[PDB]
Amino acid sequence: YGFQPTNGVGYQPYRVVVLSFELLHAPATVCGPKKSTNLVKNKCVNFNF
Amino acid sequence: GYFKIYSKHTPINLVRDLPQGFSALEPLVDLPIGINITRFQTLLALHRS
C-alpha cells in the first residue's frame, strides 16, 4: 500500500471489520439485552418478567 | 446439548457403607455446550514423595 499524508479519499488506510452471524445447531449465544421498564404495583397491568 | 451438574456435601462419620439418610441435590451449574460424551474418567494427585 502507498499510504501518504497528502493522499486523499481512496488511498488512505481504511479499517474494515466484517461480522458474520452464523446460526448453526449449537444454541445461539451472542445478542444484546432487553430494556426493562419501571416496576408498578397495585394496578391491573401486564408483564413479561 | 446442555451439561448439568448438581452437587451436595454432607459431613459423615461412618466408614464404608452409604448412610440410610435422605438429602436432595441442588442444581449447581449448567453448561450450554453440546458434546457427545459417552465415557468418563477420574483424576487423582498421588503423593509423589
Ligand SMILES: *[C@@H]1O[C@H](CO)[C@@H](O)[C@H](O)[C@H]1NC(C)=O
Ligand atoms: C452426536 O453425534 C450425532 C451423530 O453421530 C450428531 O447428530 C449430534 O449432533 C452429536 N452431538 C454432539 C456433537 O453434541
